[PDB]
């Protein structure tokens, strides 16, 4: 069907200079290559956070420590305050 044929040939070929050969675009007055693959290519890193979330920050955890190796001057206080609790107990 040459209706279908000529329709599909113009359908294929009229944007084929926008897809097959990159002679960017004749009817569109703004250029097409600085829309999606140049501006909007960094789109998702213009739409999400840059240099922390997309670079993802493989980050070292803060090494949380013990009671800093001091028994004496606080274990005696814990012992005497425990005497005071057992007074109150």
């Amino acid at each position: 069907q040459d209706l279908y044929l000529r329709e599909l040939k113009d359908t294929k070929l009229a944007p084929s200079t926008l897809q097959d050969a990159e002679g960017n675009v004749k009817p569109w007055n703004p250029p097409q290559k600085p829309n999606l693959p140049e501006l909007e290519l960094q789109g998702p890193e213009a739409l999400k956070a840059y240099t922390e979330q997309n670079v993802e920050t493989a980050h070292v955890a803060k090494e949380s420590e013990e009671g800093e190796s001091e028994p004496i001057e606080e274990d005696w206080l814990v012992l005497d305050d425990a005497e005071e609790t057992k007074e109150s107990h």
């Binding site: 998702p44 739409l47 999400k48 997309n54 955890a61």
Partner: protein, 52 residues
């Protein structure tokens, strides 16, 4: 006074086990903290790749 004596009979024998096993269950979960690091980095990766 015999009763208040008899309550504390076997208690020190049990709280020398209470002490150890309780502090072990406290401090064997910084393992899970350094697991959480591996969790949250993969969560960030899943979030950004979902954005992709």
């Amino acid at each position: 006074r015999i009763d208040s004596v008899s309550q504390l009979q076997n208690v020190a024998e049990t709280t020398k086990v209470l002490f150890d096993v309780s502090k072990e269950t406290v401090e064997l979960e910084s393992e899970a903290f350094e697991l959480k690091q591996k969790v949250e980095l993969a969560h960030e990766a899943k979030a950004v790749l979902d954005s992709w």
